[PDB]
Amino acid sequence: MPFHNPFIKDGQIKFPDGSSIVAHVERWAKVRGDKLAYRFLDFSTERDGVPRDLTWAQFSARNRAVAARLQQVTQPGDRVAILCPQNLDYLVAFFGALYAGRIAVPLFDPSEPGHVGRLHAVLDNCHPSAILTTTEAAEGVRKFFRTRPANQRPRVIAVDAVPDDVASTWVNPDEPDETTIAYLQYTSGSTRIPTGVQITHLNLATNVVQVIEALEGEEGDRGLSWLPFFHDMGLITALLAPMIGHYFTFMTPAAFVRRPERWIRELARKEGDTGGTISVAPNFAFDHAAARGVPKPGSPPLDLSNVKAVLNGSEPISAATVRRFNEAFGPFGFPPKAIKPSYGLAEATLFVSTTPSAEEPKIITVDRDQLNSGRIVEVDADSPKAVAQASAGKVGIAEWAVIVDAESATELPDGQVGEIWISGQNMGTGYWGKPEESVATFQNILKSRTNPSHAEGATDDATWVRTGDYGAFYDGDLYITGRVKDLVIIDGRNHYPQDLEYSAQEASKAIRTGYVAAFSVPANQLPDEVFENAHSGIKRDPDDTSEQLVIVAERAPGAHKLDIGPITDDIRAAIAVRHGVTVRDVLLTAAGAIPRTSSGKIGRRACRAAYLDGSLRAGKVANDFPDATD
Amino acid sequence: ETHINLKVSDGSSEIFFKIKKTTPLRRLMEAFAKRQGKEMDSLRFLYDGIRIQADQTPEDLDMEDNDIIEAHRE
Numbered sequence: 236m237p238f239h240n241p242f243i244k245d246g247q248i249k250f251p252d253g254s255s256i257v258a259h260v261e262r263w264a265k266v267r268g269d270k271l272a273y274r275f276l277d278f279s280t281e282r283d284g285v286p287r288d289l290t291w292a293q294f295s296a297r298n299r300a301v302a303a304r305l306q307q308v309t310q311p312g313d314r315v316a317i318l319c320p321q322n323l324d325y326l327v328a329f330f331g332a333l334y335a336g337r338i339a340v341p342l343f344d345p346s347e348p349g350h351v352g353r354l355h356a357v358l359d360n361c362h363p364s365a366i367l368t369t370t371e372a373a374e375g376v377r378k379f380f381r382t383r384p385a386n387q388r389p390r391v392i393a394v395d396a397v398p399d400d401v402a403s404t405w406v407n408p409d410e411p412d413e414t415t416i417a418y419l420q421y422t423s424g425s426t427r428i429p430t431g432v433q434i435t436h437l438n439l440a441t442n443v444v445q446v447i448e449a450l451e452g453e454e455g456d457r458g459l460s461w462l463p464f465f466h467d468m469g470l471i472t473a474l475l476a477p478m479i480g481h482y483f484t485f486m487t488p489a490a491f492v493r494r495p496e497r498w499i500r501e502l503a504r505k506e507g508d509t510g511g512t513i514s515v516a517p518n519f520a521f522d523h524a525a526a527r528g529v530p531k532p533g534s535p536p537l538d539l540s541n542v543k544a545v546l547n548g549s550e551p552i553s554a555a556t557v558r559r560f561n562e563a564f565g566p567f568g569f570p571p572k573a574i575k576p577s578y579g580l581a582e583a584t585l586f587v588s589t590t591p592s593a594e595e596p597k598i599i600t601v602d603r604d605q606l607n608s609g610r611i612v613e614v615d616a617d618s619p620k621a622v623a624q625a626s627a628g629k630v631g632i633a634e635w636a637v638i639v640d641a642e643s644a645t646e647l648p649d650g651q652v653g654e655i656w657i658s659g660q661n662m663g664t665g666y667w668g669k670p671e672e673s674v675a676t677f678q679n680i681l682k683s684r685t686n687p688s689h690a691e692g693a694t695d696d697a698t699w700v701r702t703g704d705y706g707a708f709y710d711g712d713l714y715i716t717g718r719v720k721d722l723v724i725i726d727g728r729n730h731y732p733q734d735l736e737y738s739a740q741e742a743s744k745a746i747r748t749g750y751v752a753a754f755s756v757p758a759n760q761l762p763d764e765v766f767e768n769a770h771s772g773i774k775r776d777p778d779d780t781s782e783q784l785v786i787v788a789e790r791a792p793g794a795h796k797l798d799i800g801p802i803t804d805d806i807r808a809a810i811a812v813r814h815g816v817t818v819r820d821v822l823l824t825a826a827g828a829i830p831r832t833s834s835g836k837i838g839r840r841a842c843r844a845a846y847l848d849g850s851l852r853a854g855k856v857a858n859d860f861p862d863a864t865d
Numbered sequence: 866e867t868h869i870n871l872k873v874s875d876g877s878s879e880i881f882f883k884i885k886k887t888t889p890l891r892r893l894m895e896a897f898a899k900r901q902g903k904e905m906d907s908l909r910f911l912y913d914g915i916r917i918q919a920d921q922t923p924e925d926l927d928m929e930d931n932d933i934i935e936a937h938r939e
């Protein structure tokens with residue numbers, strides 16, 4: 236009766252023939268075709284929702300029909316972009332592409348607001364031969380592609396109009412090998428243009444097993460999500476079902492935002508539950524549900540003592556977020572251990588590490604001076620040197636993470652900060668259309684290990700992925716300190732931008748957390764206003780290329796307008812006093828000026844590029860991603 | 866070859882045509898329209914569930930020999 240993972244034999248992941256996710260769906264369709272597989276909670280008409288269900292047999296029939304059509308109008312190796320709204324047909328489209336032996340590219344309905352830049356970027360990278368959408372979304376799709384070049388408007392298919400009987404000619408693709416790409420997982424584009432990780436069927440099945448292992452997932456554990464399927468975390472949670480054997484329930488992000496209690500109520504114990512709910516949540520989901528999702532006084536009873544796991548990722552978990560969610564939902568039986576901080580990224584399919592099931596989220600405070608010098612040392616939370624670091628827990632099975640001095644490719648002792656490199660069969664096989672970056676990122680050799688080593692279990696000729704993150708192992712746990720490309724290096728000293736950004740928002744009322752970015756630029760690329768300002772502390776020199784600190788922040792929409800003078804003064808003094816670095820320029824913009832990512836987070840390299848070009852200054856619309864040369 | 870065979874169906878009447886890939890589907894649509902006793906704008910024509918315009922050609926739509934056009938009202 237302890238947890239046994241059916242896909243693991245002697246600590247190893249074993250896949251017989253027919254272990255691709257397509258084979259698993261077809262298997263369920265055969266042995267229990269009438270069993271519920273996928274449920275979409277449709278809130279478009281009914282406020283309380285209308286469940287739309289698909290059994291395994293029904294799911295299979297739709298997948299094979301779409302796949303058969305796809306095999307008539309596309310070639311092996313072609314990419315097929317999914318531009319469906321988030322509903323059952325999105326999954327039919329995605330699986331249909333897999334069933335067809337084509338490379339799925341999960342995107343979104345172009346009618347969705349704000350995301351058009353990402354859509355162009357992905358289409359310019361992977362060039363799909365077919366677009367899958369629905370009849371409802373078809374017109375918006377047509378209109379979107381009118382904004383693409385005439386030779387960039389691939390054929391469009393509405394998957395809900397493809398008849399069942401089309402499936403009769405479907406050909407099951409051959410058993411995939413470890414090079415057979417199933418789909419592209421695009422990165423969030425935090426430090427660059429979104430890049431497409433090549434996820435194989437082996438990658439996918441492996442990481443599903445790794446997630447099942449990490450969560451101790453059972454067939455009675457209902458899966459639940461509101462996340463977009465084009466997000467890293469959104470997709471994999473929806474793909475557990477054919478292997479774990481639960482049914483998966485989802486809603487749109489807009490539905491969650493409008494009424495977060497909808498998610499809370501689905502998390503809760505249902506009559507007939509024989510397991511615990513598994514879901515997924517960025518910090519925002521916790522924050523929003525805590526503030527807008529607590530049942531009103533007099534509401535029906537709410538029991539959250541059943542929840543097994545809410546996987547938290549894409550970011551470090553916040554201590555305040557954890558406090559607020561448990562204060563809000565603890566009275567309803569929510570188990571603090573259900574919050575699972577985790578480390579993940581597209582390059583690993585998704586999942587790398589999380590807490591053991593016994594444990595609660597761990598957030599420590601470390602010494603700023605030691606941290607900036609590359610070492611982790613704990614200090615009291617009330618110390619003026621305190622910097623918060625969130626544990627991402629333990630590396631998963633058949634997977635490895637090591638902390639490394641990148642230049643020499645040698646493992647560092649615990650407590651020391653370096654590049655996180657990772658290895659495992661869940662690691663993607665490259666970036667689409669970027670062969671050189673693929674070699675540099677995915678094909679690294681670990682030249683030297685410590686004793687003991689976090690690479691223990693990996694072959695010595697194993698290939699290692701450069702995550703682009705700084706981090707460390709400390710007291711048994713993995714911590715991510717920041718992004719390599721974002722590290723602010725000025726006058727021979729290191730500064731973490733989020734640490735600088737936190738000081739800036741603390742210094743001024745006009746500076747809001749999440750609406751400020753810190754980065755450096757060469758001195759001679761600074762705008763003229765800087766050199767003409769007395770308080771900047773720097774004057775023009777065409778040969779001065781030394782890195783200088785820049786802060787860019789947004790004001791609230793409205794409440795126009797206050798003097799930038801005392802705002803700049805407050806920020807400059809506060810950062811100098813705490814960090815010993817002097818900001819050379821503080822630029823304030825209107826709301827929505829600063830380029831952001833999928834998640835809705837500031838992309839610092841893109842903010843930097845838009846500062847330097849200089850869009851933000853004159854109020855121009857800023858490019859959502861940095862140039863490929865950045 | 867320069868021609869393809871196209872089959873149009875409204876759920877009952879399954880009528881076959883032949884047309885040059887460069888020829889607008891207008892004449893083909895109107896031909897099917899009245900053999901059903903209806904007029905053209907009383908019908909919508911779909912190819913893979915996507916609405917066709919009358920001045921679009923098979924070549925514009927990457928149609929192949931023996932493709933199906935489904936005809937609905939509205």
Ligand SMILES: Nc1ncnc2c1ncn2[C@@H]1O[C@H](COP(=O)(O)OP(=O)(O)OP(=O)(O)O)[C@@H](O)[C@H]1O
Pocket residue numbers: 421422423424425426427428429430467548549550551552576577578579580581582625626627702703704715718
């Ligand atoms: N527990 C965590 N703590 C801190 N950061 C995290 C955590 N989990 C994920 N992240 C951040 O999210 C990243 C994964 O994001 P994703 O793969 O979607 O693209 P991205 O790295 O944000 O964008 P790009 O690769 O284009 O710069 C990780 O590399 C890490 O930087």
Ligand SMILES: [Mg+2]
Pocket residue numbers: 422580702703
């Ligand atoms: Mg990344």
